[PDB]
Design a protein around this ligand. Structure first.
Ligand code: HDD
Ligand code: HDD
Ligand code: HDD
Ligand SMILES: *[C@@H]1O[C@H](CO)[C@@H](O)[C@H](O)[C@H]1NC(C)=O
Ligand SMILES: *[C@@H]1O[C@H](CO)[C@@H](O)[C@H](O)[C@H]1NC(C)=O
Ligand SMILES: *[C@@H]1O[C@H](CO)[C@@H](O)[C@H](O)[C@H]1NC(C)=O
Ligand SMILES: *[C@@H]1O[C@H](CO)[C@@H](O)[C@H](O)[C@H]1NC(C)=O
Ligand SMILES: *[C@@H]1O[C@H](CO)[C@@H](O)[C@H](O)[C@H]1NC(C)=O
Ligand SMILES: *[C@@H]1O[C@H](CO)[C@@H](O)[C@H](O)[C@H]1NC(C)=O
Ligand SMILES: [Ca+2]
Ligand SMILES: [Ca+2]
Ligand SMILES: [Ca+2]
Ligand SMILES: [Ca+2]
Ligand SMILES: [Ca+2]
Lengths: 688, 688, 230
């Protein structure tokens, strides 16, 4: 906020002006008489409406729906023996960042909690150029060659004739593609697991996906995978809960990130690399160049390089978040590409697509895209040229500008250089590498590694999605492919969708596992920004007062208590009308609120002597409680509030149901335990 | 320069970087082996070539060919009793300016010296907003309603089928339009006179064309015409000279301006207004709203308000000159529009057309277009948004931003306001005003007011142009219209083009004149930047030495002496091969150079022993001399240099031919007298 | 469909081609060897990805979320005593139409069932030119002068800092504008009633909102409101 502040427009206590600084008024069109026609000479009208008429720019072709934040990177060491990259050159060295998180398929107003792969794009504004790692929350991708991207995306996006369905793979074309292109199976399993529906952007990890090269000044290389290890913990929804959130708060995840940062609860990730040798490319039984494969951490551990903290919200979403233009081609000395055909083609796309978004070639001149390092080159002109180059002789080699700008390379001026030992060999060809052909072993590895509940969630997701697939041909092709991963998986999905159970095809079956790969099964590391909804009543003021008492006990772990009541009164945060279970990570019925939770509240006729409230829909309080329970959330009750649990047929003997006499330390302890468990998986049926 | 310098990129003694600050080299593509194919991952190649591929923007729809300079305006007074305009509020108040001069019809890269109307666009960067007067070097325009602009311009521009001819009205469609739309006749006469082919942009006046309103803080108005009175004086070419210049130096006028500013010979114009009352709109015998009419200075004198000086060339032509986007809608408090239908429609076009040029709505954010005043409004977003608005509540009326930005109007915040007594009355209609119907009386006024030679130049121009009109219908229609101006004019043109001499139609004939309206007839006020070509010979070093001697005698009046010889040697500026009469305002043959001017030099056989030079084309020196004479320029000879005059059959008794013994003060005095006269009109035949 | 069919591209049982008619394959990038780098000379790759990279156009500034259908209008009469409009000149005269329905505030991909005013835009492809009535499902609008449109829309649309909330008036700026500009109250009541959340586009009426003029060949006029009665 040193650098960007030069572009700020402050509009506090000032007179309105045109875009060229003439003071104006803008509330009435210029007319010929009181009731007359509007005049063409009204330049105030036309300038104002013209800016409005042209406000929009094309949404991103993929990842249109996203949110961003500023942050800072701190290096944990001097990594110069591993890479020449300046931002990693010293312990404690700090580098500004901008990060954008996103879904993939949906357009820009689609719901945050759609099931999808998620983007995780991080820019380092380094002292030797902008460096972008444009990653995902899943370490593998659907396809093995960038040329297949429009096929994949056309298949997952809405139908060409009617543009249905929005932000969903639950339609024929998507599953047609997945089953025709089995490379997709690994990513598919991740997306059908908890990783497709995370609780927030703070509760995911990030991955560069591709193998990259790190390069030292003397040209030595290592092969790496980039990791962003989240310091909050993994937390994910179940499907029915994600759907409900989409209806109640389309902005759920962007709101969570914004509010956490405003509250000073800065989320953090550690940057790590799996460090490998050039000679390791084929050593592990798969190709390091294949973006559908993970390197299990049992084989190569993650070496931690430093830490990113997100600590500042944008001032203007459009200027900063909408306009940020990431490119994997934003590379710096000390990093190089590999021959991963997915990565290779990506490099073309990100330079080209900004011409669509920006409408011209000078997109790197936007404040959010500018480097924090000097720019000196012979590039010229183009629409939207915001600089005035003083050198009128824009060519090399020259004598007219005394040989400047000067060439920079491996040995002089700290130039970028391609890793010097990289070689090409063989015939020019359009082929699929024979090393890429195992599409099934790693999906089985992932499947083996999940807790039973998460295996079920995958099954339930695929049952849901493929029941929406009309084509019998597609449904059958899907089951055949799933069967090559696991006969159990295929059989459990087939039974819901009218497909005969397949016989085992054991070519790729195995029992290998890798640890903690699922979204479920580990406790949260931090509870920052989680919310407890305290269901209270204005008719019993002592119920409302329990909010403040519970809050004081939970403040130190960064948990907010939200007081819900029938109407806005002192110390009430929101009304039952405006509330839903999906807003809260835990729900607590306050002592004295139990009268709102009658078991007949859903269907009772609102007669005068029923004394039903008009302040919220029939059964709203009980609905919040029951939804919270069914979704697997921590539920609690204080004092007589436990009567509400009985009305809802919720036994206090169940895990994740807590009762307390009052809102003391003993109760807060239970709630903290519940919140760290996050979801109580014993409430979900599993196939026998 | 304090403002624009923040956008400067200095590339002296620096390493080459990408657009995002990464040091690079850019001289070899990345290849697979020494003789291999280029790799897609070469981001250095692609960023460099993408910038190049997108360098161009659409040329302006009209006035594509032009040049600009920075300057400063000084007010001669406190004009607050005449106008609320801030830049005219104090004696000695200074305001930065940018000015662009242009032709109209030709594309980018067309010749400076095409016959055309010329643009004269001046921006004042005032403390209360940018104010543009977008004018021409002729006070009247061809048409009376903006809606006819595409018709006029399609007719004047090249044919639709083959795009011939460039930058010329000498084709059927132009003269078809002129003869079908007699409103065009007044501007046509100005353009066919010397005003169509000026010597330089320093030697023209400027005009706002339209009647505007000036308005005081209390709402009182005057009607005005804006004038830019040039302080150098009017100077113009003859047609055959303008053509030869187009062949030898397409950049003649832009070069003249650039070099004059570099030499510190800053051209100046005084801003003036003819001040009239609202009640004067019809009382002069024509309508002040009619842009085809002048107000003769005999009826209303010009009141001088201040002075513009142009004193700094751009640093980068594209960034500054190509991207400057003028608008008559860039108006400030203290000025208002009139109901001139040409002005009225212009207001729409200049806001719309910048969307084409810039490719998006944020063109006022380009450095050259930004105001030197604060911007505060609720306009938002759009492609190429270079600001970050801090106010997230971009609407009025608001409480969320405490009611800011606040409305500015006549009485508060110094807002723009429409002159409060302007009224509308009558039926909505698409009609030509009955007050606009006299198309011929003022053309006759202009014709009457010219010296005989300039009458002849109009005749000669029309003879040239209409001899290139194939259609007999068009030729006949032209003569009919000209005849309504003057039977003399019509008959003189008709005789060249095979049209029968028309009978007089005396409806609009009159004998009134207005003073000094032509481009010819007055002496120059300043000789700054005029050029004397001294034709010398390396074989007679004393001839070259006369250059320095003549230069010393002429340096005090800002005239340059250019020494021309066979080859570059000490104190030689140009070679005969690279020289032409059109480069010089006067040509002098040096003592000792006379041997180069033999009468047989055009046709002698260049055989071995003939002695003829290969250093320049046959007859070049004599050609320069004879061209200079025929074009009407000052011609001189020193010492035995006078033998060259004898060879060219040029008698020294002729006006504007001067001889002397040596380059002393007496000869220099004669040259200054010749340069002040500029063109010797007695060398041109006139109809009897 | 006779008119639009000339622009149809039929891709049943055909070989794949480039945009300039050259038969191609598009499933593997051209590489230097089996595991090598992708070549710049792969024009098949670049044309395919360039088309993809540039698929999107800006969404409409308002009414971004909408759907359309083709149809046909039939005149019930010869209305020449009321209007010179050609498409209303004979009983039984038929004119092709296209209609788009929409919400107002939400972006592309926002929910159909957001509470909002709804667009009802109908084009008549008449024999004397295209005629559009660009209407809404509510007969009155929030503001009385077009110059206030960006103010209304900036207030209703998501906050400038964080772009929250999507497709909703349930935030401070919207209600700030509504309460500062009481002209908005009539439309507000319609939108807060069932008209803000219809069951479908088939179960709403349409309105031109503005008073228009109808004019006969001899220049006689009536003032009208246009209605589409479902
Ligand atoms: C050849 C096409 C192609 C392919 C194969 C990929 N992408 Fe990409 N992606 C684009 C073409 C593209 C794009 C069309 O160029 C986008 C849309 C907007 C933009 O700036 O780039 C983009 C955007 C985009 C964004 C959003 C950046 C932002 O927030 O603005 C992310 C996070 C990713 N991609 C991530 C990935 C990952 C992790 C990939 C595989 C490992 C991947 N993409 C493959
Ligand atoms: C309605 C169409 C129209 C009409 C009737 C006029 N103009 Fe204009 N003119 C334009 C439409 C336009 C334009 C298409 O909007 C241009 C082209 C580029 C631009 O910025 O504006 C322009 C450019 C343009 C320029 C170039 C500004 C520059 O250097 O960038 C000048 C000097 C003028 N015009 C002068 C005039 C004069 C003195 C007019 C009559 C008194 C006139 N124009 C009538
Ligand atoms: C001056 C600004 C302005 C104002 C005051 C209005 N509109 Fe409008 N409207 C636009 C500016 C606009 C626009 C920005 O020009 C749009 C966006 C996309 C487009 O084609 O036009 C548009 C789109 C648009 C659409 C979508 C057409 C489609 O489906 O593509 C409809 C149905 C309406 N408007 C309806 C109305 C109604 C019934 C209005 C009041 C009676 C109204 N608008 C006032
Ligand atoms: C890098 O390795 C070298 C040689 O082994 C040694 O000087 C040093 O321990 C290392 N330096 C850093 C940056 O840790
Ligand atoms: C880098 O540039 C320098 C200076 O021109 C040159 O000497 C050197 O050989 C270049 N190449 C490499 C690979 O270092
Ligand atoms: C303006 O007019 C008044 C009254 O006629 C006069 O006294 C005053 O000097 C004028 N102001 C200027 C700046 O000329
Ligand atoms: C200008 O605005 C002020 C303050 O809002 C208002 O009182 C006044 O009527 C306006 N003045 C004119 C001349 O319209
Ligand atoms: C000159 O103009 C005046 C005023 O319009 C007019 O009365 C007079 O007749 C004209 N005289 C000549 C010489 O035609
Ligand atoms: C129009 O009006 C006339 C006279 O009132 C009437 O006779 C005629 O039938 C009308 N035309 C139609 C088509 O209704
Ligand atoms: Ca391949
Ligand atoms: Ca329990
Ligand atoms: Ca008119
Ligand atoms: Ca010649
Ligand atoms: Ca003489």
């Amino acid at each position: 906020q040193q650098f960007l502040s030069q572009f700020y427009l402050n509009d506090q206590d000032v007179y309105l002006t045109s875009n060229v600084g003439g003071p104006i008024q803008d509330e009435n069109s210029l007319s010929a008489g009181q009731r007359g026609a509007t005049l063409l000479q009204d330049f105030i009208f036309r300038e104002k409406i013209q800016r409005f008429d042209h406000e929009r720019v094309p949404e991103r072709a993929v990842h249109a729906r996203g949110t961003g934040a500023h942050g800072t990177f701190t290096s944990y060491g001097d990594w110069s023996n591993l890479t020449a990259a300046s931002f990693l050159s010293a312990e404690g060295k700090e580098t500004p960042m901008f990060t954008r998180f996103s879904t993939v398929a949906g357009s820009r107003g689609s719901a945050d909690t759609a099931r999808d792969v998620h983007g995780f794009a991080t820019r380092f504004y380094t002292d030797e150029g902008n460096f972008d790692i444009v990653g995902n929350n899943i370490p593998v991708f659907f396809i093995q060659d960038a040329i297949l991207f429009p096929d994949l995306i056309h298949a997952v996006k809405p139908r060409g004739d009617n543009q249905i369905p929005q932000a969903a793979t639950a339609h024929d074309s998507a599953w047609d593609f997945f089953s025709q292109q089995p490379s997709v199976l690994h990513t598919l399993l991740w997306a059908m697991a908890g990783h497709g529906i995370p609780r927030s952007f703070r509760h995911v990890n990030g991955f560069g996906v591709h193998t990259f090269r790190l390069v030292t000044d003397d040209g030595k290389t290592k092969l790496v995978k980039f990791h962003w290890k989240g310091l909050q913990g993994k937390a994910s929804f179940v499907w029915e809960e994600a759907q409900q959130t989409a209806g109640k708060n389309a902005d759920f995840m962007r709101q969570d990130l914004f509010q956490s940062i405003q509250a000073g609860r800065f989320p953090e990730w550690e940057l790590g690399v799996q460090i490998m040798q050039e000679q390791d490319q084929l050593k592990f039984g798969f190709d390091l160049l294949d973006p559908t494969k993970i390197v299990p951490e049992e084989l190569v551990p993650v070496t931690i390089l430093g830490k990113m903290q997100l600590n500042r919200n944008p001032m203007n979403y459009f200027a900063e978040t909408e306009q940020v233009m990431f490119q994997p081609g934003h590379i710096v000395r000390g990093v190089d590409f590999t021959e991963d055909p997915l990565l290779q083609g990506r490099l073309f796309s990100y330079l080209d697509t900004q011409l669509n978004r920006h409408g011209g070639p000078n997109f790197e001149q936007l404040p959010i895209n500018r480097p924090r390092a000097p720019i000196h080159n012979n590039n010229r002109d183009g629409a939207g040229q915001m600089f005035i180059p003083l050198d009128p002789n824009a060519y090399s080699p020259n004598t007219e500008n005394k040989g400047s700008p000067k060439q920079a390379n491996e040995t002089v001026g700290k130039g970028f250089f391609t890793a010097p030992e990289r070689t090409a060999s063989g015939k020019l060809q359009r082929t699929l590498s024979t090393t890429f052909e195992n599409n099934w072993s790693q999906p089985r590895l992932f499947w083996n590694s999940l807790v039973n509940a998460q295996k079920e969630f995958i099954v339930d997701a695929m049952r849901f999605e493929t029941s929406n697939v009309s084509s019998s041909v597609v449904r059958d092709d899907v089951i055949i492919q799933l069967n090559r991963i696991s006969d159990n998986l295929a059989t459990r999905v087939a039974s819901a969708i009218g497909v005969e159970a397949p016989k085992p095809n054991s070519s790729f079956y195995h029992d290998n596992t890798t640890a903690h790969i699922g979204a479920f099964g580990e406790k949260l590391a931090k509870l920052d920004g989680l919310k407890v909804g305290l269901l209270a009543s204005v008719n019993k003021p002592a119920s409302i007062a329990q909010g403040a008492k519970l809050q004081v006990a939970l403040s130190s772990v960064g948990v907010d208590v939200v007081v819900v009541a029938e109407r806005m009164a002192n110390n009430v945060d929101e009304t039952y009308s405006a509330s839903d279970a999906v807003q809260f990570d835990a729900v607590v019925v306050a002592d004295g609120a139990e009268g709102l939770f009658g078991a007949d509240s859903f269907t009772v006729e609102p007669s005068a002597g029923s004394g039903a409230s008009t302040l919220y829909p029939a059964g709203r309080p009980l609905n919040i409680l029951l939804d919270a329970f069914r979704f697997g959330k921590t539920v609690g009750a204080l004092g007589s509030g436990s009567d509400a649990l009985e009305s809802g047929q919720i036994s206090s003997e169940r895990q994740g149901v807590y009762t307390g006499k009052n809102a003391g330390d003993a109760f807060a302890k239970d709630i903290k335990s519940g919140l760290s468990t996050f979801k109580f998986l014993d409430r979900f049926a599993v196939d026998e």
